[PDB]
Design a binder for this molecule. Structure first.
Ligand code: NA
Ligand code: NA
Length: 310
């Protein structure tokens, strides 16, 4: 009945109006495209997110096991934020960051603000002070599990780390929306992530699928991300891409994947082709061709982005 379709639209609008856009969506809907987003380093993930990258002014959670690639994803977001003229901060309670690797994948490490805080509440308060400044495009918190309460650190009952996260996130969400700063919480499956799950606008589950071989020597991992929560665009999408040892997320490899997925790149044998021109025989050659030829990589990227959302 058309009388039903009127009441459904109405119901959706009341919901949308009462609790915000993205409060309900059809999974087949097209995404409303924001003015600016933070790209992820893989076009595949950017498409999975619907809006071409991470949202501004929101809480993001990126989680996965040890050696999943979750930190690499956050660092690519940092690099892109910086490359577009943004300021980045990294709140580090893990003490694991490798800046040489970060630099190689595109982070301006010299300009990166880093804090290594004494306690969980100090970490979040420093994040909060930085956010309220209005000067940051992105702040990354590594990691949730390491945000240990002052009382526990001073040797004084348990369950209060979750409460620490809840209160802080309540305060922080306001500051982020007002500032336009994106906050990424890295979380490791082994946490005060009960509250983060509801405050987050985007949640990404990151895993290693398989190791990429160079003859008999390892040169990276195929990486899978599922967007398990997404308030900006239909959730539950997933992407794969490559993380190459020493280099990070292969942008060019991902352009190829989505190129062929979208029919923009055709396949005649092991040869990948683009507009009757040949890219390479086998993935690595095609990948390599795109790094040597930045111009065709941008062209392919441009064409994937226009063919859908953005
Ligand atoms: Na890309
Ligand atoms: Na690292």
């Amino acid at each position: 009945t058309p009388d039903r379709e009127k009441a459904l639209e109405l119901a959706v609008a009341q919901i949308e109006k009462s609790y915000g856009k993205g409060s309900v969506m059809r999974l087949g809907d097209e995404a409303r495209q924001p003015i600016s987003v933070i790209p992820t380093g893989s076009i595949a993930l950017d498409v999975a997110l619907g809006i071409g990258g991470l949202p501004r002014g929101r809480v993001i959670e990126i989680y996965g096991p040890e050696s999943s690639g979750k930190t690499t994803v956050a660092l690519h977001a940092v690099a892109n934020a910086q490359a577009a003229g943004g300021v980045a901060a990294f709140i580090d309670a893990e003490h694991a960051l490798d800046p040489d690797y970060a630099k190689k994948l595109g982070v301006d490490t010299d300009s990166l603000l880093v804090s290594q805080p004494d306690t969980g509440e100090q970490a979040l308060e420093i994040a909060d002070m930085l956010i309220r400044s209005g000067a940051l495009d992105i702040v990354v918190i590594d990691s949730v599990a390491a945000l240990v309460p002052r009382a526990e650190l001073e040797g004084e009952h348990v369950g209060l780390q979750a409460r620490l996260m809840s209160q802080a996130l309540r305060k922080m969400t306001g500051a982020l929306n007002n500032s336009g700063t994106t906050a990424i919480f890295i979380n490791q499956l082994r946490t005060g992530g009960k509250a983060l799950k509801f405050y987050a606008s985007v949640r990404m589950d990151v895993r290693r699928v398989e190791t990429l071989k160079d003859g008999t020597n390892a040169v990276g991992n195929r990486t899978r991300v599922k967007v398990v929560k997404n308030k900006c665009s239909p959730p539950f999408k997933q992407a794969e891409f490559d993380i190459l040892y020493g280099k990070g997320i292969s942008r060019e490899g991902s352009l190829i994947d989505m190129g062929v997925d979208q029919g923009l790149i055709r396949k005649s044998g092991a040869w990948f082709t683009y507009e009757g021109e040949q890219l390479g025989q086998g993935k690595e050659n095609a990948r390599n061709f795109l790094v040597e030829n930045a111009d065709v990589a941008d062209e392919i990227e441009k064409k994937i982005k226009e063919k859908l959302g953005i």
